[PDB]
Amino acid sequence: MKFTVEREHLLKPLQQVSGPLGRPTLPILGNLLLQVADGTLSLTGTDLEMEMVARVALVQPHEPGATTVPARKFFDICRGLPEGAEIAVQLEGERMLVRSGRSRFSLSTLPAADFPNLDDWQSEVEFTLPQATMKRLIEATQFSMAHQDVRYYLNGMLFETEGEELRTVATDGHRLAVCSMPIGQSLPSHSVIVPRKGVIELMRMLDGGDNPLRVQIGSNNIRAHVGDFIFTSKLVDGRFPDYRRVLPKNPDKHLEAGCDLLKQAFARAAILSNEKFRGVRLYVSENQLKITANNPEQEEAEEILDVTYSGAEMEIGFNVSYVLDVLNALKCENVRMMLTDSVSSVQIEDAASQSAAYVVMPMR
Amino acid sequence: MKFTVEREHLLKPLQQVSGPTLPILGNLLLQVADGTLSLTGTDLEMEMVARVALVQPHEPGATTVPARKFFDICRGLPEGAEIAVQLEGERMLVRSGRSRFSLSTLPAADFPNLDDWQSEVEFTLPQATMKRLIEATQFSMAHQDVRYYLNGMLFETEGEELRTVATDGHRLAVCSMPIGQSLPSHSVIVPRKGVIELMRMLDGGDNPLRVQIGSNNIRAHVGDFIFTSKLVDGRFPDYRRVLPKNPDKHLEAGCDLLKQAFARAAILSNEKFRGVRLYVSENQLKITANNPEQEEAEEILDVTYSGAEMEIGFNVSYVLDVLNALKCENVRMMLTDSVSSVQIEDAASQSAAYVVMPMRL
Numbered sequence: 091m092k093f094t095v096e097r098e099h100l101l102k103p104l105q106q107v108s109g110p111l112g113r114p115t116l117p118i119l120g121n122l123l124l125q126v127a128d129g130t131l132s133l134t135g136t137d138l139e140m141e142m143v144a145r146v147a148l149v150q151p152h153e154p155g156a157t158t159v160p161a162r163k164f165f166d167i168c169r170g171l172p173e174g175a176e177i178a179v180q181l182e183g184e185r186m187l188v189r190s191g192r193s194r195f196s197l198s199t200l201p202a203a204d205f206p207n208l209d210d211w212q213s214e215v216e217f218t219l220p221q222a223t224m225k226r227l228i229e230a231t232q233f234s235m236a237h238q239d240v241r242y243y244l245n246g247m248l249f250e251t252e253g254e255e256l257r258t259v260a261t262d263g264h265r266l267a268v269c270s271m272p273i274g275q276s277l278p279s280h281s282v283i284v285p286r287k288g289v290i291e292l293m294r295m296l297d298g299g300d301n302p303l304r305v306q307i308g309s310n311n312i313r314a315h316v317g318d319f320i321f322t323s324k325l326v327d328g329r330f331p332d333y334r335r336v337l338p339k340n341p342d343k344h345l346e347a348g349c350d351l352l353k354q355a356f357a358r359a360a361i362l363s364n365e366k367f368r369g370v371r372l373y374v375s376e377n378q379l380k381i382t383a384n385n386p387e388q389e390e391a392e393e394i395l396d397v398t399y400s401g402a403e404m405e406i407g408f409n410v411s412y413v414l415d416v417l418n419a420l421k422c423e424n425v426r427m428m429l430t431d432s433v434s435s436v437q438i439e440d441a442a443s444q445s446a447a448y449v450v451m452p453m454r
Numbered sequence: 455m456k457f458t459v460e461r462e463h464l465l466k467p468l469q470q471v472s473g474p475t476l477p478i479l480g481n482l483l484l485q486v487a488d489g490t491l492s493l494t495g496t497d498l499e500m501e502m503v504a505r506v507a508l509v510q511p512h513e514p515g516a517t518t519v520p521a522r523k524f525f526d527i528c529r530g531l532p533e534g535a536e537i538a539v540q541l542e543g544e545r546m547l548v549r550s551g552r553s554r555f556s557l558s559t560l561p562a563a564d565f566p567n568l569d570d571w572q573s574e575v576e577f578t579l580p581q582a583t584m585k586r587l588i589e590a591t592q593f594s595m596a597h598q599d600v601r602y603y604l605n606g607m608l609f610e611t612e613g614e615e616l617r618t619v620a621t622d623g624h625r626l627a628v629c630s631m632p633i634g635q636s637l638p639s640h641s642v643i644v645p646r647k648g649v650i651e652l653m654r655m656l657d658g659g660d661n662p663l664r665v666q667i668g669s670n671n672i673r674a675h676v677g678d679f680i681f682t683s684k685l686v687d688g689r690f691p692d693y694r695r696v697l698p699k700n701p702d703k704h705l706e707a708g709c710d711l712l713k714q715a716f717a718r719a720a721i722l723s724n725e726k727f728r729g730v731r732l733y734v735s736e737n738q739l740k741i742t743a744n745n746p747e748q749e750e751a752e753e754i755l756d757v758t759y760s761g762a763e764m765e766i767g768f769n770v771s772y773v774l775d776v777l778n779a780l781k782c783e784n785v786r787m788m789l790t791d792s793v794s795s796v797q798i799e800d801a802a803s804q805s806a807a808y809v810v811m812p813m814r815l
């Protein structure tokens with residue numbers, strides 16, 4: 091195995107395939123698989139749950155073969171070499187020699203044949219969409235995912251195909267985000283759970299260009315192709331809860347207000363909320379919202395804002411972090427809060443589009 | 455106590471005074487007197503006093519409030535906001551637009567004041583010079599060493615120069631700058647936390663700093679801020695005895711090439727104690743590293759060197775720290791032998807000097 095590649099054709103690929111890898115439980119898991127074959131260097135990183143594969147074309151002399159070497163050491167070497175460096179690599183038994191200028195690096199190898207390999211699987215649904223759509227879908231809901239919950243499925247993100255739409259759902263038990271976006275193709279109905287780390291990789295591989303995303307989904311896997319990267323993840327086995335089941339029945343009490351005015355008042359109020367419980371109270375009345383927080387020292391914050399509202403007056407408490415998370419993920423001009431009563435969750439949406447909705451439970 | 459003041463005029467004062475365990479140490483002392491608002495923060499070891507002018511109706515008085523909360527509130531208000539503040543028994547009410555806040559207070563009397571003391575040594579210098587002096591040597595301070603007197607920086611006055619020296623027993627940094635004033639010869643040790651805070655009040659503009667040094671205290675005045683720190687009470691080593699007495703072997707090298715070769719080679723050094731071996735020979739330097747994996751790095755660099763060949767190891771971070779402090783075209787390394795420390799300087803300046811012990815590999 092031999093190749094010589096210019097630094098910058100190696101770097102971005104090396105970073106992408108390092109993404110699944112911290113502290114490797116076993117040595118081979120900290121390695122990348124390098125393969126030269128029919129004119130192409132493939133780089134593969136895995137954590138056993140997912141794989142990221144990069145392909146780099148080789149325009150300079152090369153010879154086939156395969157080995158594995160430490161991912162971070164090799165990345166840091168290529169990164170630290172000077173701009174435009176030629177990186178000449180050759181497998182030499184138990185070492186892989188890397189040379190560039192008068193820099194020389196000897197990396198210890200482990201057999202390519204020992205590198206872990208995701209099992210072959212079959213595609214069942216396929217579609218293409220813009221990267222901006224996939225980014226939109228993920229950033230809309232990602233924050234609502236659970237973090238290291240014993241209920242393993244909540245640590246992921248639900249991906250769901252219905253009619254002409256791709257949808258994401260995330261929840262942690264206390265709050266929910268769902269976001270549907272259309273993609274100009276009719277589709278079958280699959281409902282799959284992507285693991286937290288896969289959602290991060292998916293996001294990581296969107297460059298913000300005009301290469302579209304090809305998605306493939308099987309019973310137990312998901313694959314995304316962007317440009318010269320192929321990301322494949324095992325799917326999480328479980329039942330994600332049902333979003334239709336938890337949206338509010340009849341929240342015909344509608345408050346409309348500026349997203350940023352609301353965010354900043356909630357932000358200011360939160361400063362004097364309970365440090366642990368983060369509760370604030372909202373008083374709604376004709377065209378007016380009042381937000382108050384207090385903490386056990388009897389410090390108090392009050393914010394008054396003009397809003398659009400015709401309903402009966404009411405009063406309700408929310409965890410201000412959850413509201414702020416929602417308003418931060420909204421990044422729109424106006425928000426719609428759809429209330430029922432002081433003991434019922436609120437549904438929050440961009441006032442100008444129902445493509446996303448958020449459910450937050452009330453607190454006493 | 456009541457004042458109404460532009461959010462605009464409180465931001466930078468609050469940022470400065472929220473820099474310096476006990477509960478009232480997390481509070482700010484606010485004082486209105488003679489048409490001025492004074493804000494003070496402290497950690498008992500140092501303090502920062504900021505002053506704001508008050509043109510709008512105001513009432514004299516004083517109290518203390520949670521520093522981070524008062525800061526986050528004022529900062530959280532919208533740009534252009536007016537902030538009306540009034541003391542009201544055991545609470546301070548803050549108001550702006552239709553936002554209202556009541557913060558808990560502690561009595562202004564209970565707020566600690568650093569004991570009064572007397573100035574013995576005084577001088578003015580540009581902010582820029584003080585920043586250069588601190589930047590040159592800051593990284594060589596000890597962090598949490600039993601030898602308390604290394605956990606900080608020597609400020610020395612000699613001739614018409616201010617000098618800083620810092621060291622952790624393994625590497626040492628010295629920098630001197632002329633301030634155009636005849637000074638008595640005098641040495642004090644500023645605690646590192648004090649050095650860090652002094653640096654953060656230096657915005658890098660045109661503005662002289664005024665320094666006042668007491669037997670146990672240092673004070674700096676710039677603009678509308680007054681920073682005061684206690685000194686550290688011990689015996690700082692003498693940089694003159696640390697400089698190698700005749701480092702006869704002199705090598706010059708490109709700063710950045712040296713740095714990148716050090717940084718790259720270190721990738722394959724020991725993760726816990728990162729060191730590289732240097733083999734100096736006729737106009738050539740080779741840097742090598744090894745690790746328990748039996749992995750090896752080698753960099754060869756063109757350098758300027760004639761004189762006896764030798765192999766000597768160095769700690770990577772000590773050298774990198776020096777080369778980053780230097781940020782110049784070429785560095786000179788003045789070597790003695792394989793067992794002795796080395797002196798490093800900017801090849802085109804003696805303003806600063808670094809001494810680094812060798813590492814056995």
Ligand SMILES: O=[N+]([O-])c1ccc2[nH]ccc2c1
Pocket residue numbers: 621622623624625626691696795809810811
């Ligand atoms: O680098 N040195 O050789 C060095 C640094 C600090 C020191 N303090 C006392 C001796 C000494 C030496």
Ligand SMILES: [Ca+2]
Pocket residue numbers: 392393394552553554
């Ligand atoms: Ca109010």
